[PDB]
Design a protein around this ligand. Structure first.
Ligand SMILES: [Ca+2]
Ligand SMILES: [Ca+2]
Ligand SMILES: [Cl-]
Ligand code: NA
Lengths: 115, 116
């Protein structure tokens, strides 16, 4: 039996926002992933993003690469990325995913605060 | 001015882009293009225009002292002068993120307890 957990809601919000911002600026996907990793304060997240990037540099899509961490990026997240990649809208779906992740962080906090 | 979350957003985005090695004017263009808030887009385009004309970022931000306070602009100035804008922006992003997180949690906790 194996078992791994995802990352915190703020941690997902930060990296999704950074990746969306970098991709939308017109930088190569691999270079965007390098920057998000290198700017991370979270060793596990840094390692994960180095591994996602490693797959991207072998030529795989972002969605397929995120596939190596299904415990972190769920099927829906990876489906949204794939939809963007297939339709030529990776930039605007990453924006959507960033907005989603930030809203998720906020609502999780709203639920739990003062408990 | 603008909200605590919106300052955190643009500061994180600008820090992220600058630390990637992208020229400052190009970074400012991207943050502008990506903004949902028309007022913020306007401000960033105006700041970008000034930077391309040779004004420093710190001097340009002084046109919006209601958004970028004396500490913020002072920090940027120190970074530009020293050739370390990249790391100063990172610290401003961390600071702004932290402020948003801690203030948002107080807001939510206050809402939750006060209205229960
Ligand atoms: Ca948005
Ligand atoms: Ca940091
Ligand atoms: Cl893991
Ligand atoms: Na799917």
């Amino acid at each position: 039996f194996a078992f791994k957990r995802g990352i915190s809601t703020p941690d997902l919000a930060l990296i999704t926002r950074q990746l969306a911002t970098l991709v939308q600026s017109g930088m190569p996907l691999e270079e965007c992933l390098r920057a998000v990793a290198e700017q991370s304060e979270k060793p596990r997240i840094r390692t994960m993003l180095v591994a996602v990037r490693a797959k991207v540099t072998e030529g795989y899509t972002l969605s397929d690469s995120l596939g190596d961490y299904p415990h972190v990026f769920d099927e829906l997240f990876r489906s949204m990325v794939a939809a963007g990649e297939k339709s030529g809208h990776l930039d605007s779906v990453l924006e959507r995913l960033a907005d989603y992740a930030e809203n998720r962080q906020k609502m999780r906090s709203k639920l739990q605060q003062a408990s």
